[PDB]
Design a binder for this molecule. Structure first.
Ligand SMILES: NC(=O)c1ccc[n+]([C@@H]2O[C@H](COP(=O)([O-])OP(=O)(O)OC[C@H]3O[C@@H](n4cnc5c(N)ncnc54)[C@H](O)[C@@H]3O)[C@@H](O)[C@H]2O)c1
Ligand SMILES: NC(=O)c1ccc[n+]([C@@H]2O[C@H](COP(=O)([O-])OP(=O)(O)OC[C@H]3O[C@@H](n4cnc5c(N)ncnc54)[C@H](O)[C@@H]3O)[C@@H](O)[C@H]2O)c1
Ligand SMILES: NC(=O)c1ccc[n+]([C@@H]2O[C@H](COP(=O)([O-])OP(=O)(O)OC[C@H]3O[C@@H](n4cnc5c(N)ncnc54)[C@H](O)[C@@H]3O)[C@@H](O)[C@H]2O)c1
Ligand SMILES: NC(=O)c1ccc[n+]([C@@H]2O[C@H](COP(=O)([O-])OP(=O)(O)OC[C@H]3O[C@@H](n4cnc5c(N)ncnc54)[C@H](O)[C@@H]3O)[C@@H](O)[C@H]2O)c1
Ligand SMILES: Cc1ccccc1Oc1ccc(Cn2cc(-c3ccccc3)nn2)cc1O
Ligand SMILES: Cc1ccccc1Oc1ccc(Cn2cc(-c3ccccc3)nn2)cc1O
Ligand SMILES: Cc1ccccc1Oc1ccc(Cn2cc(-c3ccccc3)nn2)cc1O
Ligand SMILES: Cc1ccccc1Oc1ccc(Cn2cc(-c3ccccc3)nn2)cc1O
Lengths: 267, 267, 267, 267
């Protein structure tokens, strides 16, 4: 059991296909005690989480609500029992208005919208560290989720630009985080079939949405030396737990690529 | 002459210390017929432009102003005579509330503020692109000003994150600018003491900021294999003018490091 | 146990301060049955390995010897018993003649000598993948030691170049090793005083070179957001064990930074 | 004219479709006094060099020839008149045995051949810099030819490794030419149909060469935001002149991308 002891916060669950779900599962399979946080559809996230191995707490956290952020360390400490601190925080959060995604012209998305995506997808990583680092033991990890925005691509539009700032924010978080002996990292996963995969990126594609298999399976399974599997999230979960473990103890402000090696290949 | 005949629009002039002032001057010397935009202190900017070698038109461009961007389309054409287009555009524009800068803590920066910075620092590259690309001739360049943000650093804080996104946006303009025959690039300059810079370097933004800003400005020259001068703005103006020219016709979505080679060395 | 049941070959031990030795000890601690290789002073190496927490077989491997490579495939299976195969291979091997290193100019190293360093430090990575992939299991892992050569530096000179090579070779091996079910990566470690290093650090390879040394070695702890101490190889000896394990299953051709996060920071 | 009165040494011409040939032509149009260096078939190079828009001195230079480099500064001074110096060096030199190219398996290229490949196409950039830096005026430029080696790719095999070091070397020539006030940069060009393309890459690629070649132009013009045409060598010739002129006066140890901007895009 790799994450034994280790109390870990885990945000961004919505379905049993949602990335955070498998991070949560694999964590529990390795002896982690969890605290999970939801957003908007709580009765529904609630139903989902019972499928996880252990009975685990569920806090509400709209990452745009300044009140939810203040009362966060509060609500958490009362869930793992005061005295005990957090060893891990997982940030699997993202949103971006459909107006700056897929076939909708890049120039046409308004800043009002792109701000919302950037607030949730990237800034919220720093605002969560503010909230949680206090209630964290030294040697514990923060892990956030990233998709390689280092090159531009069709569809991913303004979410590329957001994830691009996520990366930057993550290198500045690892400094504040290090003051407490805590690491801050992102995992750059390949594509995984989840809700956002199909609803956000999927719907904003419209007619040229048959692209999603050409582009993708082209840029990933074809490129990856060990193959990629859009239907298999356990790889990226296994990788997220490695950063939560003590086994990458000198890695911080970094990005790990769980993408089948596809960013290191051109063809 | 170099930019002979070409019609370049240049934004971001505020003083004669400003990067935009030099890009403008060096341009004019090479035969560029200009158009300028300023922001806020228009009468004060009017004074400074008359110091440039030749007289050039001046337009008001609040980059946050929805009206301005829209009419900007026309106001320019009315300024160079309809039946004439721009063969280049320079975006030397930037901002961040003294809270995502300096001694001011990284976490303390409110998103309300971090956004106002990003709106002006990064997004407005796409703003101007959509605004102006219709009145742009094939063969033209768009050149934005950038500061190497791939690594974190003290004080610069949320401006790094904004510059980090501005780079990602640059690659998504490159794609749309490509329709019209235009290249999109950033010149990553090293530091020049200006209105914005020298403010935080004297302790106005804290004594511990001006401290960390020495180590930067000094250690930069050390690394630069051909040296670095905070006071000479001419080489970056010269480099920006090279992209405006006919001489880099295979560069787009890309970044040119005009930093005296500093980013390539470790010590 | 982490490598519980895995049978890993570890090259490159020469003292009890070699990055190798620690990788091997930590690997043994986690339940990994081992096989080792040594070079040159084989008699003294014998002494060293015995101080390991477990008995391990020792093979001779002059990575330049085109014969040693040829038999190596077989000599190993002989050492773990036919019908058994390796679940991991480690490559902590490197060498550069004191002419492309130190007070010695960059220009003065002859190609004869530069090549020797490149044969042992870079090419010899594919050398061993060739020799060993046949006898490797699926799920297996290849890991070799890297030192961040993306930016140039004083003194390291040609070993810098040979790492830039080694980095590229790693991405190719990944393609070939992917055929057998095997990931191939590099742990990019910070500086460790491991004899090899600590030689130049005291004035052996010049006093001005040893000067430029501690400016790096200390410039590191300052940059590293969680700090970095050069006398402790246990953080990196673990990050190697992370890749050998089954917890990094989506990563190949990649480079992991166990450097205390100093490659992410500028200051 | 752009390079008026400047004296420039261009190596590695061998056809009228060689890249160094177009670099020569375009420089002369800008008004440069050239000095060329060929290799082996010096008499045939001579027939080709009269095709140039001017007459210019042609020397013999086997970069693998200890005598040639040794005499090199000599027979150059002699051919531009003494008291005069160089302002420009173009390094357009490359080679790798067919054994480490195309479909010829990667592990099977012997280090014997992989070494010759490096030395010539990589090391030689440093050994020429030594040869000429003495005889260069401050303000000059050394320029190399590079293919983007950051990600791996089919066929380009061990030549990816050479170019992968040709960069690491170029960052060390940068700081030794720093001493003399001279810049050292590489131009990463896109694919351009030349002799080497057809003989070494399309030669060691079997019957399926030319098929991958037609499919590369397509899948590059695609990725390029401003398109790309393999038959036109002009744009990369124009980019290398931009690096010789005064106009990128603060760019050294760096790489300029002349690929139509394809590396910044993923699809
Ligand atoms: N599956 C992919 O292809 C993929 C690959 C790499 C990285 N990512 C990133 O990793 C994460 C995983 O996303 P996913 O694939 O699981 O889709 P998902 O929608 O199932 O998970 C994303 C989560 O965002 C949460 N969320 C949305 N708005 C919020 C707000 N205002 N405040 C707090 N939470 C909010 C949702 O409740 C949801 O559970 C995201 O950050 C995403 O951008 C996804
Ligand atoms: N000073 C340096 O050392 C340096 C180095 C590298 C990159 N840069 C970048 O170059 C650009 C400008 O640098 P600078 O030294 O000239 O700063 P500056 O303060 O001297 O002038 C920059 C411009 O910001 C403009 N601006 C602010 N808000 C605006 C808005 N809402 N709408 C339109 N314009 C607005 C101002 O009007 C001003 O003219 C920026 O993008 C900056 O990040 C500066
Ligand atoms: N010392 C550090 O701080 C440091 C940091 C990052 C990466 N590295 C890398 O890690 C590896 C080893 O570093 P180290 O700290 O263990 O120093 P070390 O000298 O103790 O280990 C280097 C190895 O070179 C081996 N060697 C030389 N020629 C050989 C050949 N022909 N065949 C087989 N082995 C040969 C030696 O036997 C020795 O074990 C290298 O690849 C090196 O560049 C070292
Ligand atoms: N062909 C492309 O599209 C392309 C793209 C990016 C970079 N490049 C680079 O540009 C340069 C030239 O390639 P090219 O397209 O002009 O092919 P080319 O063969 O027409 O020119 C290459 C030159 O290398 C010379 N050469 C080979 N061995 C030599 C040696 N031992 N000493 C001195 N000269 C030697 C050749 O004789 C020839 O003149 C190389 O560095 C190459 O890798 C080419
Ligand atoms: C949570 C969230 C909010 C907002 C946006 C996305 C999102 O979640 C993600 C969903 C999928 C991916 C990866 N991805 C994209 C597409 C694709 C389609 C077309 C072109 C190229 C990529 N396919 N696989 C990354 C994500 O971050
Ligand atoms: C217009 C504008 C508004 C708001 C902020 C910046 C800005 O413009 C810039 C001005 C100078 C630079 C370069 N730079 C960095 C530093 C430094 C500072 C603090 C700490 C360590 C380094 N000094 N000089 C970059 C800019 O983007
Ligand atoms: C195995 C081997 C053979 C030959 C040479 C090196 C070598 O191995 C390494 C030893 C130490 C390092 C890390 N490192 C570099 C320096 C340093 C010195 C001068 C300037 C700036 C850095 N100090 N610590 C990396 C290595 O690859
Ligand atoms: C001078 C020299 C000696 C030896 C080898 C190359 C060389 O020079 C070059 C020749 C052509 C290119 C461009 N390129 C690559 C390939 C390709 C085909 C298939 C897959 C992936 C790449 N096709 N076109 C680049 C070069 O640097």
């Amino acid at each position: 059991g790799l994450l034994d002891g280790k109390r870990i916060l885990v945000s961004g669950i919505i379905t049993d296909s949602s990335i955070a779900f498998h991070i949560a599962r694999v964590a529990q399979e390795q002896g982690a005690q969890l605290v999970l946080t939801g957003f908007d559809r709580l009765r529904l996230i609630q139903r989902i989480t019972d499928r996880l191995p252990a009975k685990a707490p569920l806090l509400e956290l709209d990452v745009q609500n300044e009140e939810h952020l203040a009362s966060l360390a509060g609500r958490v400490t009362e869930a793992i029992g005061a005295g005990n601190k957090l060893d891990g925080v997982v940030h699997s959060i993202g949103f971006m208005p459909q107006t700056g995604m897929g076939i909708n012209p890049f120039f046409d998305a308004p800043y009002a919208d792109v701000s919302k995506g950037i607030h949730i997808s990237a800034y919220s990583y720093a605002s969560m560290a503010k909230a949680l680092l206090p209630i964290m033991n030294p040697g514990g990890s923060i892990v956030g989720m990233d998709f390689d925005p280092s090159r531009a691509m069709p569809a991913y539009n303004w979410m590329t630009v957001a994830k691009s700032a996520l990366e930057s924010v993550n290198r500045f978080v690892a400094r504040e985080a290090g003051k407490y002996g805590v690491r801050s990292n992102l995992v750059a996963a390949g594509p995984i079939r989840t809700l956002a995969m199909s609803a956000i990126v999927g719907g904003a594609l419209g007619e040229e949405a048959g692209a999603q298999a050409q582009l993708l399976e082209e840029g990933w399974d074809q490129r990856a030396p060990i193959g990629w599997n859009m239907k298999d999230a356990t790889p990226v979960a296994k990788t997220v737990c490695a950063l939560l473990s003590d086994w990458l103890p000198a890695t911080t402000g970094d990005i790990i690529y769980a993408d089948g090696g596809a960013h290191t290949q051109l063809l």
